[PDB]
Enzyme design. Structure first.
Site, PDB file in Angstrom:
ATOM      1  N   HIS A   1     -10.495  -6.673  -7.014  1.00 41.01           N
ATOM      2  CA  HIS A   1     -10.243  -5.723  -5.928  1.00 41.01           C
ATOM      3  C   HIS A   1     -10.972  -6.185  -4.683  1.00 41.01           C
ATOM      4  O   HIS A   1     -12.027  -6.816  -4.776  1.00 41.01           O
ATOM      5  CB  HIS A   1     -10.758  -4.336  -6.360  1.00 41.01           C
ATOM      6  CG  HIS A   1     -11.008  -3.382  -5.229  1.00 41.01           C
ATOM      7  ND1 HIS A   1     -12.252  -3.215  -4.651  1.00 41.01           N
ATOM      8  CD2 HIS A   1     -10.182  -2.517  -4.590  1.00 41.01           C
ATOM      9  CE1 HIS A   1     -12.172  -2.311  -3.689  1.00 41.01           C
ATOM     10  NE2 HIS A   1     -10.929  -1.864  -3.638  1.00 41.01           N
TER      11      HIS A   1
ATOM     12  N   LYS B   1       0.856  -1.179   0.000  1.00 43.04           N
ATOM     13  CA  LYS B   1       0.000   0.000   0.000  1.00 43.04           C
ATOM     14  C   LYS B   1       0.891   1.228   0.000  1.00 43.04           C
ATOM     15  O   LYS B   1       1.654   1.467   0.947  1.00 43.04           O
ATOM     16  CB  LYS B   1      -0.952  -0.012   1.201  1.00 43.04           C
ATOM     17  CG  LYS B   1      -1.933  -1.198   1.175  1.00 43.04           C
ATOM     18  CD  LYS B   1      -2.810  -1.223  -0.083  1.00 43.04           C
ATOM     19  CE  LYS B   1      -3.927  -0.192  -0.014  1.00 43.04           C
ATOM     20  NZ  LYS B   1      -5.002  -0.428  -1.020  1.00 43.04           N
TER      21      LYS B   1
END
Lengths: 376, 376, 376, 376
Positions: free
Chosen positions: D296, D169
């Protein structure tokens, strides 16, 4: 196992019946270059191409290396002469085409086959031609009277000749060109109609004229303006198929013209493109890109017309009335082609299917020797 | 004035020497369709094309209308059969090509000329071929050992065979394909090197692999992925010439592939494109757009290879080592072609220049009758 | 836990009521391939697809590997057979579609649900169809009389049948096609009107005709010319929605057709695209790109029409009158579908909602055995 | 003939094991909306979607009109609710997806089939998932120490968990993100590696970082920057496949993203796209354009993960390690899915193949009632 033993070249002047006016000039005759290729088997192939002294000069320079080669070896010949068109331009392609055609004639004669049959065989036996009209057909006319005079002339030519198509030679006077076309269309509502200003109009004038001409449903607008860029601007605005024999005249022009969407129809012409195989290839390129194709005329006599007829006969996409100055000639150097009701009969028999009158060849070469080229 | 009197069709099975692995399958033999066209002059033309029963079926349906026509009339034949490929696809082109080739053979024999000479004459007399390597050449290998085993194999094949080019059949294992190519290049720094995954890689994997492969200076990357869109995305990112025999397989594909900048090199293949004239036309299209051209192999025996050799011999742009399964066959149905030091000699003599062993033809047709097609 | 135990295949010939003329041919019957998939639970699924012997042959080759698989496993089946359309083309998609449809029928029967309900459920219960008119409907007519004869025919068909749309089968005679459409529009000012030359017009003729046809507000112009390139040139010039079932016939064609702006409307067809899920996917692709969608007819009988009806019933974007040869058939191999006032009622009940008359199936398979395919 | 009798909605809070840091926030739990659809046959379908109070509110407003409808009628439901996403955005798609999933569950249970089998059947039985790493995994670290700390963490997670892929991330600190990826790649040379800044980088910084990251051969760079325009500028310069779940999040975005060449890989997500059929459709769109596809994760619990597993199981193009927060959850509201060696087993059995623990549902709904949403 034919080997070429001799390459002989003449330049001839032949007369038209009436004057012929483009945006470029007014002519009363053709000058052409004639080539005979002789082989060790006795076969003689004949070619013919555009223009005179400078084209003949190129052929004679290519000739010594042709001696001892096979007329079948055209791929090798074209590759050997690849640089000729870079320097000599249109005349270079033309000179190569004369040799090319003579070799096809010799190949057909050596094999007992027509050139048509060596090109895929016939799909049609007759070739429609186009009535060519110019302002020289209305000699006396005032600007006010010109359109009517041109229309009355067009009607006579179509009714007497059986032509499927009419092509107006345009001029720098684009407003007058439009007026003439309006009158011709009114008089001949069903004829395929074209105009060819030979690139004499600016792009803005081509757009203005093109818009005006939409109502006439022309078969095509041919070379209104100069260049791929200008032609593409016209095609973007004007809803008439756009044709050229001036902005795409070699394969190097083709990819750019497609990417820029410059033309809808391309004229082939063996003498402009350097040979018969190139012209068959161009036809395939047109089919691949969904383009129309026709044939351009540079003033072909019988030998050169016979070659074009073999191409049209064997080529599906050449389905239009071709341009041909042939019907406007007062004589020829072969026994005349069959022209009836506005169409030429494809020759039959070995090679180009023509028989050369060597007395007329000698005579008209003498005319050229004394009078000089009418071209150039 | 040849007229066709008979069209006869056989399907044959012929053996390879060793197994052959694509991303698609693993084969140990070829199945082919053979056609003989007989004329009223006694001339017999031979053609050969890919696959078996379904291709033979198409030829036999086209045959009755071929009776009484001239083998020279190929333009008319192709136009008559224009809808066949729309429905029958690749097999339709293939069936048409068998007839096409047989007619060229008959035309050459009728005229006493080689097919090469009817196609523009020779520009080269020898045709280099490509060493085809697959994972079946390293049967025992662990993933860790596979690249070295493949490289050692490639070296042996090149040193023993004199091949100018090596082509790896790629797989769904793109990382392993890259590892193999790295080892092969290290072992053979000077060889022209290619990989052909037969469209088995996704576009993102093709980009990742292509980037990795840039350092190896491949002659080309052949069909990494499916489709004009995907191929164009690869060409936009990867600096390796991109070749296809899968996304451009007919003329209808060509204009879109050019506008979308999908490929740098196109494979021709007479059997895929429906004939010899189509293949000559494709060569001209490649020259016009600055594309490379090579020939694809669908498992040609001697008749079909001889046709491809006539094309290569007479076509300047076919200057690369072609793909050819011919050297991998254990037998043939003609007297064998001359293969020496990694190049095939172009046949000389009338037509395709081959002599068919009708005993072998009969034998291998029997093998097919009992064993069934190996294709399809 | 259904497992397939048997795959059986028939080829049938069924008659039309009157002849049907496209630019391509004139037909008087349909030949179709019928497939029954049997499972170990006793469920029998039925499929039907276009053409005869060659399509049946492909199905029979795919059959042995279908034994022991679940009819629900369609993703796996399609992936296994991914190469079939590369070689067999349209016939490959068609053969796969027959199996695909039979599996959907079996899935519905096994679950007690209609295929419509397995596809998202109904959004409409009736499907309008299109009156198909051809020059065979004016047999006696002179060129001068043809437009009036066609218009009078169109009026009778619309008034008697309640059709929402009329589609003219176009020809190589594009000027005559335009004349006919003008007369039909004059006679039927409110009907949705289409013309489909089946790609028979050149691009320049398509532009000239398209311009002429703008005044008639056609619902669409369907495949005037060949290829994505040509279609895109037409769309750039002609202000009539452009439809295809010929230049976009698989997903590989779709991205290039969008980038080149080739079409406004795409025809789906389960048999052309290889299955029902592919057709639902195509509908979504059309919505994403703002394209219209309709369904093409390849001569479906009752089984194949029932599948198309399930698709239309459950698919919002299929909001047009579809093409359907169904009303022109003289018989069927199921109990007849409900056709009333120009619309077909979507079947209800498990699977495709049809009941196969096995006596008619056997009879018409015999007709085919003796008479041969009418297609191909 | 199922008719819906009840639609009941809960909002639940469930805990993670460790904190999770995006560029956007740091979370320690999930809030989700759960829907049960009851029918008159006693069948109960379950759905689950992202977020809490505002999503539940939308579902409850759509509910009254669902009463009396068939769970099979999803096309009609989606069309009826077509305007919901225009106003409610992502939350609107999410609310529709909960109902959509519950209906698929009910359809499977009513038919005795898995959702996987109603979606084309399995092509894979296991689904690899991705190790998600964030800066919260290196709590103590100085900027100088952060890359090493992150790499050591990544190695532990991969070695202990068997993950095929690792996703970092990213943050506004793009230089630090690059440093971390360099260290992770050095430590794990063979792992598929991704970074997702959640659109936090400017376009120039995305180009600078992308160039720097090329040497690491990332599987993809996911949403470096905001918008189709910015993403396209990145793709034009940076040679790393570009993935999104932010600039293409509905079909209206897809055509523009393709024309502008914005992305190489698209994330699907049932809850973002409003349903299962939409996600299958998106997969087909990706195949047509040669795009990669992945899934996702928006924080799915067991019900929502089971739906995604049915999609992946039946969808060839979903061949990558998906994103899934599932392994990071401390509990679930169904009997736990099988997670072993970094892959989730696709459920078997009717519907989604899950059994809901209604005591845990009631408990975690109470937790939400007292604690409030963790989202929004």
């Amino acid at each position: 196992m034919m080997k070429i033993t001799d390459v002989d070249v003449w330049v001839v002047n032949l007369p038209l019946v009436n004057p012929f006016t483009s945006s470029f000039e007014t002519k009363t005759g053709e000058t052409r270059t004639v080539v005979r290729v002789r082989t060790d088997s006795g076969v003689e192939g004949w070619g013919e191409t555009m223009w005179g002294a400078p084209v003949a000069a190129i052929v004679r320079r290519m000739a010594p290396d042709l001696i001892g080669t096979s007329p079948f070896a055209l791929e090798a010949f074209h590759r050997k002469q690849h640089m000729v068109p870079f320097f000599y331009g249109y005349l270079g392609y033309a000179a190569i085409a004369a040799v090319d055609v003579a070799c096809w004639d010799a190949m057909g004669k050596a094999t007992g086959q027509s050139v048509t049959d060596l090109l895929g065989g016939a799909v049609r036996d007759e070739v429609p031609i186009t009535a060519l009209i110019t302002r020289a057909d209305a000699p006396g006319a005032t600007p006010a009277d010109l359109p009517k005079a041109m229309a009355e002339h067009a009607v006579r030519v179509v009714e007497e000749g059986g032509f499927d198509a009419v092509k107006l030679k345009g001029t720098t006077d684009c407003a007058g060109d439009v007026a003439i076309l309006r009158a011709v269309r009114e008089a001949l509502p069903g004829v395929n109609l074209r105009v060819d200003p030979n690139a004499a109009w600016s792009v803005p004038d081509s757009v203005r004229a093109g818009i005006a001409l939409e109502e006439l449903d022309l078969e095509y607008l041919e070379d209104p303006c100069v260049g791929i860029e200008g032609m593409a601007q016209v095609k973007a605005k004007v809803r008439i198929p756009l044709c050229t024999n001036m902005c795409v005249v070699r394969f190097e022009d083709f990819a750019p013209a497609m990417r820029l969407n410059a033309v809808d129809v391309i004229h082939g012409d063996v003498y402009k493109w350097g040979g018969i195989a190139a012209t068959k290839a161009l036809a395939a390129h047109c089919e691949t890109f969904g383009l129309g194709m026709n044939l351009h005329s540079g003033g072909e006599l019988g030998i050169a017309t016979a070659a074009h007829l073999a191409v049209v006969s064997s080529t599906p996409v050449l389905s239009r009335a071709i341009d041909s100055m042939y019907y406007l000639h007062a004589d020829d150097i072969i026994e005349p082609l069959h022209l009836e009701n506005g169409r030429l009969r494809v020759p039959s028999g070995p090679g180009l299917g023509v028989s050369v009158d060597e007395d007329k060849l000698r005579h008209y070469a003498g005319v050229n020797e004394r009078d000089g080229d009418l071209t150039g």
